[PDB]
């Protein structure tokens, strides 16, 4: 009926690290090849969370662009093509300049 | 050097389900317990992603509120206290209005 999440278990996942984030696919962010693509959103490892001391930003150190297979709904002929998004590798807590 | 992601693996994590999402701790969401809460953000299971059809929205079926141990920076005496947040259990795709 009830569970108390330990503070250690709280901050471990809260710290600035690479994590799975849903990214909505738009005509502005990744362009137009068809009217709409399926799925209309994807998941990539991004730098999320928060630093212990206020005054330190959560920013990526290294990043690599990954390519994913996406279903492109085109009217001449619908095809399963390829797309690309920028994915983060590792993050660090740097002081906010 | 790089590698491709299979479309099955693309949509599986992209489909509407419960997933780990970072939530920034704000005074608008949780009131005065400290000037700064540590960590300043936490992680809860939330309904993210997108449904296959355009007229289908991603909404939670049922939710259970979980409580987490949080360090409250109080200048009279700093204490490791307790706070609560709403967390989803399962999600579904419904037609829109």
């Amino acid at each position: 009926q009830r569970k108390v999440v330990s503070w250690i278990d709280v901050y471990t996942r809260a710290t600035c690290q690479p994590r799975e984030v849903v990214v909505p696919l738009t005509v502005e962010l990744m362009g137009t090849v068809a009217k709409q693509l399926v799925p209309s959103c994807v998941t990539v490892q991004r730098c999320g969370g928060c630093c212990p001391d206020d005054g330190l930003e959560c920013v990526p150190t290294g990043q690599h662009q990954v390519r994913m297979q996406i279903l492109m709904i085109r009217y001449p002929s619908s095809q399963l093509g390829e797309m690309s998004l920028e994915e983060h590798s590792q993050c660090e807590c740097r002081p906010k300049k | 050097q790089r590698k491709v992601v299979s479309w099955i693996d693309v949509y599986t994590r992209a489909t509407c389900q419960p997933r780990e999402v970072v939530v920034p701790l704000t005074v608008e969401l949780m009131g005065t317990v400290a000037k700064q809460l540590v960590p300043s953000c936490v992680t809860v299971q939330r309904c993210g992603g997108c449904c296959p059809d355009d007229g289908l929205e991603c909404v939670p079926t049922g939710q259970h509120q979980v409580r987490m141990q949080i360090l409250m920076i109080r200048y009279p005496s700093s204490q490791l206290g307790e706070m609560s947040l709403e967390e989803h259990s399962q999600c579904e795709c419904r037609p829109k209005k």
Partner: antibody
Framework: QVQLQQPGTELVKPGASVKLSCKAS????????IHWVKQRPGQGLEWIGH????????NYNEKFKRMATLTVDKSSSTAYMQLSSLTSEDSAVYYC?????????????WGQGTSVTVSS | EIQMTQTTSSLSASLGDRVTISCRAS??????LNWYQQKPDGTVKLLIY???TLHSGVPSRFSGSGSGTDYSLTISNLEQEDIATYFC?????????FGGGTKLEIKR
């Protein structure tokens, strides 16, 4: 999967200095304080100093006032301890552990240790 | 430096006994105490890190108690796991001060 690495054995001569290693692997290194603790054979734990690899802010114990120097490396993810001018009294096992916040001071994960022997 | 004091060091008890290890501080640390477990091979792990809050992978036998100047680590059921020296460390202010490691032998 989260752990700290310390070379178990370390040999030096009286007068010499050691650069002890604390290789961190399994977590975001620059988000946790790295503490260093001294322990004599069958004695209590003595806090030497802690270092924040995130900003570079350091703190040393008063009695180790000139004798520990703490450094960090963002590449390779390793924390260091520079024990300047060693004597026979400094022959002890040195640990490295990590805590999270400024207020709690709770080091959750420790290293295996570094048994520093000095004799020549 | 706050002189964190452990009155007892030599301790021996039979299996399945309520074993209590206490600590006394020089001043009020406001519930900021952490109990550590140093195994015979020198490996140190964190058992209870507040008043009574458990670290990941620690049996419910270890119970944390004490509110102010007086705190105690209480093992509800003693086994053969639980052969180690137990330290308490204050977290009120720097430095972080450790007490005298109480050796826990088991009676047979």
């Amino acid at each position: 999967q989260v752990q700290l690495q310390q070379p178990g054995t370390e040999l030096v001569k009286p007068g010499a200095s050691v650069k002890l290693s604390c290789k961190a692997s399994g977590y975001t290194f620059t988000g946790f304080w790295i503490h260093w603790v001294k322990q004599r054979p069958g004695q209590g734990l003595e806090w030497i100093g802690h270092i924040n690899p995130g900003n570079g802010g350091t703190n040393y114990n008063e009695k180790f006032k000139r004798m520990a120097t703490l450094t960090v490396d963002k590449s390779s993810s390793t924390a260091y301890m520079q024990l300047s001018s060693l004597t026979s009294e400094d022959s002890a096992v040195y640990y490295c552990a990590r805590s999270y916040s400024n207020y709690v001071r709770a080091m959750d994960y420790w290293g295996q240790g570094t048994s520093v022997t000095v004799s020549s | 430096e706050i002189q964190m004091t452990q009155t007892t060091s030599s301790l021996s008890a039979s299996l399945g006994d309520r074993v209590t290890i206490s600590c006394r501080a020089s001043q009020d640390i406001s519930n900021f105490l952490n109990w550590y477990q140093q195994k015979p091979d020198g490996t140190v792990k964190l058992l209870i890190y507040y008043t009574s809050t458990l670290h990941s992978g620690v049996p419910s036998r270890f119970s944390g108690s004490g509110s102010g100047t007086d705190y105690s680590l209480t093992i509800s059921n003693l086994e053969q796991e639980d052969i180690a020296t137990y330290f308490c460390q204050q977290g009120k202010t720097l430095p972080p001060t450790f007490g005298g490691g109480t050796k826990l032998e088991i009676k047979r």
